[PDB]
Amino acid sequence: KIEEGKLVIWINGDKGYNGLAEVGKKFEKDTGIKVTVEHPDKLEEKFPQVAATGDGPDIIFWAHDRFGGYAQSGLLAEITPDKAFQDKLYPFTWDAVRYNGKLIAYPIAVEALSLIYNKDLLPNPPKTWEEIPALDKELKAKGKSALMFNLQEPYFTWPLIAADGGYAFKYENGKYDIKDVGVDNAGAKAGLTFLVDLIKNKHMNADTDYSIAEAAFNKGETAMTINGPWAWSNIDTSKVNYGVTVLPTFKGQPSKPFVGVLSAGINAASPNKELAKEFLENYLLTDEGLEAVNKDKPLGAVALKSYEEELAKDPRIAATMENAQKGEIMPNIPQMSAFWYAVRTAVINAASGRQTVDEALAAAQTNAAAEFAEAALEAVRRALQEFPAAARDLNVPRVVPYLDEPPSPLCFYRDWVCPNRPCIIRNALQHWPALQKWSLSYLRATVGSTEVSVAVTPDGYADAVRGDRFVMPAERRLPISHVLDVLEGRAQHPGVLYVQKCSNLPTELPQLLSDIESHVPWASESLGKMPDAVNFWLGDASAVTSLHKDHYENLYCVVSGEKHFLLHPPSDRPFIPYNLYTPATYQLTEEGTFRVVDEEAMEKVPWIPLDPLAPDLTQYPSYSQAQALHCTVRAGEMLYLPALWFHHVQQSHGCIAVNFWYDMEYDLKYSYFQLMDTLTRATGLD
Ligand SMILES: OC[C@H]1O[C@H](O)[C@H](O)[C@@H](O)[C@@H]1O
Numbered sequence: 001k002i003e004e005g006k007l008v009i010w011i012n013g014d015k016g017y018n019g020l021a022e023v024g025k026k027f028e029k030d031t032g033i034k035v036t037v038e039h040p041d042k043l044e045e046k047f048p049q050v051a052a053t054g055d056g057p058d059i060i061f062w063a064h065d066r067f068g069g070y071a072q073s074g075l076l077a078e079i080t081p082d083k084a085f086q087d088k089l090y091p092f093t094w095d096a097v098r099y100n101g102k103l104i105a106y107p108i109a110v111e112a113l114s115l116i117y118n119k120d121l122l123p124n125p126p127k128t129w130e131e132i133p134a135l136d137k138e139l140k141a142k143g144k145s146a147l148m149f150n151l152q153e154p155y156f157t158w159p160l161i162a163a164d165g166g167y168a169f170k171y172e173n174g175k176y177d178i179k180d181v182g183v184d185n186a187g188a189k190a191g192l193t194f195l196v197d198l199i200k201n202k203h204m205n206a207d208t209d210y211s212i213a214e215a216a217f218n219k220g221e222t223a224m225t226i227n228g229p230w231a232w233s234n235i236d237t238s239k240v241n242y243g244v245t246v247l248p249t250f251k252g253q254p255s256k257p258f259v260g261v262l263s264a265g266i267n268a269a270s271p272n273k274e275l276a277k278e279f280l281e282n283y284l285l286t287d288e289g290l291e292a293v294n295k296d297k298p299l300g301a302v303a304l305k306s307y308e309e310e311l312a313k314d315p316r317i318a319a320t321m322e323n324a325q326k327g328e329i330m331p332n333i334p335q336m337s338a339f340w341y342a343v344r345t346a347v348i349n350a351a352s353g354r355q356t357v358d359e360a361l362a363a364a365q366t367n368a369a370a371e372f373a374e375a376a377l378e379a380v381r382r383a384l385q386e387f388p389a390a391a392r393d394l395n396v397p398r399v400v401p402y403l404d405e406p407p408s409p410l411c412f413y414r415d416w417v418c419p420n421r422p423c424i425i426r427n428a429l430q431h432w433p434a435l436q437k438w439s440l441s442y443l444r445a446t447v448g449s450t451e452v453s454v455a456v457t458p459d460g461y462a463d464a465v466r467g468d469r470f471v472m473p474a475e476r477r478l479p480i481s482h483v484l485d486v487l488e489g490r491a492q493h494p495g496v497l498y499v500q501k502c503s504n505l506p507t508e509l510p511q512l513l514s515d516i517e518s519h520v521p522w523a524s525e526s527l528g529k530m531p532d533a534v535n536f537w538l539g540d541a542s543a544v545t546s547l548h549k550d551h552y553e554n555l556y557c558v559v560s561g562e563k564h565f566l567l568h569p570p571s572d573r574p575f576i577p578y579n580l581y582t583p584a585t586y587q588l589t590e591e592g593t594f595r596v597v598d599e600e601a602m603e604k605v606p607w608i609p610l611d612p613l614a615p616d617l618t619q620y621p622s623y624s625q626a627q628a629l630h631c632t633v634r635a636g637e638m639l640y641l642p643a644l645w646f647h648h649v650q651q652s653h654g655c656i657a658v659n660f661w662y663d664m665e666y667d668l669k670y671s672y673f674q675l676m677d678t679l680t681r682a683t684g685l686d
């Protein structure tokens with residue numbers, strides 16, 4: 001007694017779904033699993049709707065041209081076959097179910113349209129489209145019509161349109177040019193004008209759909225129809241003496257029918273992926289499985305070599321193969337879908353007489369171009385959005401790792417600087433007398449009277465976006481001793497203090513340099529250069545440097561206290577919002593009042609509005625797919641904070657620190673970063 005495992009399949013209702021049912025049974029007799037196959041209308045439109053919310057079928061059958069869109073939306077699981085299995089099916093059938101180098105369905109059958117004619121009514125079928133009108137009035141004058149076929153789905157009409165120059169995209173040597181779309185060129189117009197003239201001269205009827213045609217030919221009311229393999233069973237059971245042959249030519253050139261590979265995709269949202277594989281690989285794609293479907297509705301030229309070889313001597317299949325060679329295989333790109341919609345209306349309008357042929361096709365080219373554009377953009381968006389996770393999976397570790405001693409210059413460059421990952425180096429500052437000497441008492445006896453440039457801000461956030469402005473801190477020149485007073489509580493000051501950022505010898509502040517080093521020698525030998533700056537850092541515990549990135553190799557050394565960093569690799573850029581801001585600077589008056597004051601004749605300054613501590617996920621939801629790294633640097637410790645790394649600094653009260661700025665190498669890594677940042681803004685990711 002259960003409510004248990006199942007396998008539901010969607011397949012179009014012109015295909016042998018009863019044959020597929022039987023195969024479903026032999027499954028259900030060899031496991032307990034009930035296999036139910038369904039043929040809903042517009043199943044290929046329903047699937048991408050319903051499968052994203054998690055519902056939908058387990059397996060979907062359709063011509064392969066639909067299967068790329070399904071994969072661009074991530075609805076199709078990757079199929080993983082043995083190679084004893086991949087060499088069981090023809091190679092080009094696998095290539096039709098390959099999106100962005102990856103397999104997304106199992107190929108079932110290769111199908112193309114052919115000219116089905118009534119051998120009793122028409123002993124020698126026409127070789128040209130141009131004969132058909134002549135042939136029609138000769139047959140109306142015997143009580144029937146010459147040619148009938150579905151005029152409601154562009155798939156049937158397209159072999160003629162493409163004959164004299166029509167083409168979707170462009171399949172010149174190598175593969176498809178998605179800039180070169182050709183649905184409103186001379187040759188497209190020619191075939192379509194011909195189709196429309198057939199209707200005009202009442203050789204055909206614009207209202208004719210699939211069902212009207214099939215019924216007509218199978219009753220012997222039409223000498224010729226145009227259909228694919230699935231249609232043959234219903235004529236065999238009718239008793240029209242019929243043949244299947246090469247499509248007639250137009251203006252001396254062959255009809256070019258888009259070739260379709262019936263494919264089975266697996267629903268990425270299925271709880272049954274592995275039974276789906278046991279069903280298709282080992283029950284359907286067999287001589288036994290394809291036979292049971294084919295007995296119902298002929299599949300065409302199958303993908304399974306074994307059973308393809310056993311059937312290929314059917315003149316109906318040979319003819320199918322002939323027309324497929326004269327035609328071109330459909331691309332599976334997600335642009336296929338809007339292409340069909342565009343031509344569907346183009347044909348339906350030109351045949352009904354609503355628009356001329358020359359405008360219907362013009363409209364279809366224009367409107368399909370506009371979608372082909374937005375589709376391109378979305379493909380770019382995903383590339384940029386899947387990139388950040390792709391990167392950190394490969395190089396960027398989720399923690400800042402510690403070294404127990406300084407690395408060799410070689411090892412420092414090969415392990416950290418070139419791969420652009422941070423680390424904390426230990427036991428590298430123990431030769432600094434600063435580590436023992438630098439007390440807020442020794443600093444007061446040593447540089448207490450020395451006047452420095454001090455950063456004043458109302459809320460502790462220097463260089464942050466405040467409303468519509470990027471605001472820089474107020475500057476006040478104070479001795480260090482009264483910086484220390486305000487920090488120990490002994491005195492008071494408007495806002496939040498912290499010492500600004502070139503001291504140790506260019507401020508000046510030279511009495512401390514002897515307590516430190518002018519550079520990190522193993523770092524300098526590694527980067528092949530001296531630091532551009534050496535900065536002394538002292539400040540309030542409310543000073544929060546906001547999220548930004550530097551064009552410098554920064555060695556952050558902590559002498560007393562702690563430093564709390566929140567890092568993001570340059571890779572996380574597509575998910576880090578950037579805006580453009582009017583640059584300002586705080587003015588502090590002798591009232592303790594902070595006023596925002598636009599920086600005159602400065603360029604707009606790009607900055608990150610996002611607050612990584614408490615992010616507005618409503619305004620910036622994309623940021624929740626970034627991956628922050630956290631570390632804490634403390635007394636005696638040195639953080640290597642690579643170039644272009646997004647960082648956000650906090651510290652304990654009265655934290656003292658020295659940091660070296662080496663200029664970065666402007667290299668391939670930099671140039672790529674500019675490219676991404678630019679593509680992030682163009683594609684409106686922000
Ligand atoms: O409506 C036209 C359709 O007819 C058949 O189902 C073909 O398999 C499919 O490729 C074609 O698109």
